UniProtKB/Swiss-Prot annotation:
EC number(s) on file: 3.1.1.7
The UniProt record lists the keyword Lipoprotein: yes
S-S bridge residues: 64-91, 251-262, 399-518
GO biological process, one term: choline metabolic process
Molecular function terms, GO-annotated: acetylcholinesterase activity
Function field: Terminates signal transduction at the neuromuscular junction by rapid hydrolysis of the acetylcholine released into the synaptic cleft. May be involved in cell-cell interactions.
UniProt keyword annotation of Transmembrane helix present: no
Protein name stated in the entry: Acetylcholinesterase
Subunit structure, as described in the record: Isoform H form is a homodimer; the asymmetric form is a disulfide-bonded oligomer composed of a collagenic subunit (Q) and a variable number of T catalytic subunits.
Keywords, ordered alphabetically: Cell membrane, Disulfide bond, Glycoprotein, GPI-anchor, Hydrolase, Lipoprotein, Membrane, Neurotransmitter degradation, Serine esterase, Signal, Synapse
Species in which this protein is naturally found: Tetronarce californica
CC per GO annotation: extracellular space; plasma membrane; side of membrane; synapse; synaptic cleft
């Protein structure tokens, strides 16, 4: 049977799924790790023990325990990101969409979800792998990994909660794909990992980590890079936040054993309930439990690793969206609301700058403010709003990614950069948010090919070009068709630094994606806060 696959861990049984008038196979909820429950909470993941019998892989698995967005109850714009399944610490599963008939050795694409390392599910509608598997005949895999404290609590030194275990969860899924994707017709020598936001930083992290690089071929990073200011912390900060977590649960804090034993007695929701209380500053775009620079997964600091070329050299494709910061401002910055144009006052702008560059002294704040204020129209509320939107996206997504692409390109074997700036015709979020963080995902996963979702025709063509670029690049290391007549996405080089826009219009090539602002964020400001 086409829905029966025998792997190294046991026999698995799929289900047939209709997709665009046709059908493909889907193996939902295949387990790749022992449930990290009980005393295994915070611990490294363990390999799933092989099983006898047939594993029912016809329905989605549980989503990992996470914080749930209740900012707009019933709003699809935000609920579409929430877990659409029962949450459970027993969540280490992966999903596979396989063309029908089953290929023999085809290109593999592994998806790593975003969610700031505190949230995210592999079972979300926008992550449905069937359209991409089908349209590009690639074997699509979506893994899962523990988030929040469960996946990132870090008490360096202890082996009970070493930190980075969520990253390890992902590595174990990539190990399992390496080991078994062949039986599903996947070519293990050609797996491309790709993700968005935290999933993007994750991708860059496996490129960086020595223990992870031999497990994939190529990489795609959407709106995220490993060196992101919000994606990692020192062991001291990790430790400092774990203890704080404990102090919120009235835990004995005399020793790591004491702490950890207590955290393990608490029900998931108690940890999730005080999770946000541990951030060191009042901040926007910062999350409690994230990867830690521990000396193991990350041998040394990310910067020294990038500087030395201490990383997997291969091809990479990555880019960002035009208005990456609007979400974070809508959620916590004063003056922004879902149903108003969110025109910001000078004072709210300033409240905003403070909230966006948390780790900044007065001198630093004045510099960001000077860099983004039109002193000839400083009370223009739309300018203040958009300025603040740029500050958040440049500081948190674009400049770190630009810094990563520039360091990477020096030793890599091929870079392709995009700037995605088409705003979806059916976006339920307000106009002022622009081309929102996370809204290139639906084009990557091909939702515009399904009529009832109401995209325009030019949108479906974009989705197809994007899907074909992603899959062609995964297949070859180049997004362009060997001899197509379509315009060529040029390669990004240290010298030219070319990139392309990604929208419904005829492809345009440009250079130095936000240099002016990224020289400020990657060179000037850091140099200024270090002297002050
Ligand atoms: C990639 O590597 C191959 C062989 O190692 C080399 O011949 C080719 O020029 C490289 N391409 C880039 C963009 O570095
Ligand atoms: C397993 O998949 C779902 C689980 O709820 C169930 O509806 C289905 O009948 C089961 N199939 C088999 C073969 O066990």
């Amino acid at each position: 049977s086409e829905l029966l696959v025998n792997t190294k861990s046991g026999k698995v049984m799929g289900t047939r799924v209709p997709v665009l008038s046709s059908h493909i196979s889907a193996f939902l909820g295949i387990p790749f790790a022992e449930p990290p429950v009980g005393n295994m909470r915070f611990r490294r993941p363990e390999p799933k023990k092989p099983w006898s019998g047939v594993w029912n892989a016809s329905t989605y698995p549980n989503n990992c325990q996470q914080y749930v967005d209740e900012q707009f109850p019933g709003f699809s714009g935000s609920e579409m990101w929430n877990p659409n399944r029962e949450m459970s610490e027993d969540c280490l599963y992966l999903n596979i969409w396989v063309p029908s008939p089953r290929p023999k050795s085809t290109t593999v694409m592994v998806w790593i979800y975003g969610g700031g390392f505190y949230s995210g599910s592999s079972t979300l509608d926008v992550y449905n792998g069937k359209y991409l598997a089908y349209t590009e005949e690639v074997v699509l895999v979506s893994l899962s990994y523990r988030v929040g404290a469960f996946g990132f609590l870090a008490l360096h030194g202890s082996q009970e909660a070493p930190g980075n275990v969520g990253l390890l969860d992902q590595r174990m899924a990539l190990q399992w794909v390496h080991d078994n994707i062949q039986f599903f017709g996947g070519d293990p020598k050609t797996v491309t990992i790709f993700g968005e936001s935290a999933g993007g930083a994750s991708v860059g992290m496996h490129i960086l980590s020595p223990g992870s690089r031999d497990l994939f071929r190529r990489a795609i990073l959407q709106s995220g890079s490993p060196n992101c200011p919000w994606a990692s912390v020192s062991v001291a900060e990790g430790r400092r936040r774990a203890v704080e977590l404990g102090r919120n649960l009235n835990c004995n804090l005399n020793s790591d054993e004491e702490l950890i034993h207590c955290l393990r007695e608490k029900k998931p929701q108690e940890l999730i309930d005080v999770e946000w209380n541990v951030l060191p500053f009042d901040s926007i775009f910062r999350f409690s439990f994230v990867p830690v620079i521990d000396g193991e997964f990350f041998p040394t600091s990310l910067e020294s690793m990038l500087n030395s070329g201490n990383f997997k050299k291969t091809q990479i494709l990555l880019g960002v969206n035009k208005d990456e910061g609007s979400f974070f401002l809508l959620y916590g910055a004063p003056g922004f609301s879902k149903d108003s144009e969110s025109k910001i006052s000078r004072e709210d702008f300033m409240s905003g700058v403070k909230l966006s560059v948390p780790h900044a002294n007065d001198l630093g704040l004045d510099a960001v403010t000077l860099q983004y204020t039109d002193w000839m129209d400083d009370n223009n509320g739309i300018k203040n709003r958009d300025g603040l939107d740029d500050i958040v996206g440049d500081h948190n997504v674009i400049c770190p990614l630009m810094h990563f692409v520039n360091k990477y390109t020096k030793f890599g074997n091929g870079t392709y950069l995009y700037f995605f700036n088409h705003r979806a015709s059916n976006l339920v979020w307000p106009e002022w948010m622009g081309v929102i963080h996370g809204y290139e995902i639906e084009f990557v996963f091909g939702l515009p090919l399904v009529k009832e979702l109401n995209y325009t025709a030019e949108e479906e063509a974009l989705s197809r070009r994007i899907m074909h670029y992603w899959a062609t690049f995964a297949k070859t290391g180049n997004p362009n068709e060997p001899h197509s007549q379509e315009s060529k996405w040029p390669l990004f080089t240290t010298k030219e630094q070319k990139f392309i826009d990604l929208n419904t219009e005829p492809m345009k090539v440009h250079q130095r994606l936000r240099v002016q602002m990224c020289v400020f964020w990657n060179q000037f400001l850091p140099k200024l806060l270090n002297a002050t």
